[PDB]
């Protein structure tokens, strides 16, 4: 498998990126609760997930468009990019030197929308990939 | 192949997590409307709860597969607990109880269950990441 291996790697990185997103949200939330509970928040875990996500985006770019339709490949990288630059990077910065209401409003609306868009792109990418492999 | 099976499991787990986070937001908006003296629409929250339940069933059907049996088990038990003890009550309580129930249950009981699911999901992602990226030593 050469094309097959490439596809599976694209599916793998895409899944890993989406997973790092959930790790990031969950870890940032934990740290944020400690801040709300009059504590000292440790943002090293969440920053780790954020970086992991960006590195998986770099790994995805190096693999794309690969063997599939270049459009869906373009789609996934631009929505991944957006989720990072407009969602996760600003949301992290709000938790670190922003107000509580600004971080919570952004984390309850802005970042989610970007998440569902990237998630949608990822699901169609993987459905198309899976179909080709199962031919 | 092993990579595809792990990835299907990682994808079902993320989808489960996404559907759970959705559920919490979905239900909250329906309650603001109910608290605002309006006619709530529970159809969407029910959809998320049902999607969370469907993703658990799909996770079980794929497990343990190539993943360590202990980690696989932790994930399914914490997922199932979050659903049967956290999520389901909230929904049944949101359709009958008060702030003393749905709001109080959701702030005290659920979080603990949510936190355990998150710890298991981390344990899963870490081992999967090591297998997939040949990162282990
Ligand atoms: Cl591309």
Automatic annotation (TrEMBL), chain A:
It comes from the Bacteria. It is found in: Cell inner membrane. Belongs to the methyl-accepting chemotaxis (MCP) protein family. This is Methyl-accepting chemotaxis protein. It comes from Salmonella typhimurium (strain LT2 / SGSC1412 / ATCC 700720). The chain holds residues 42 to 176 of 547 of the full protein.
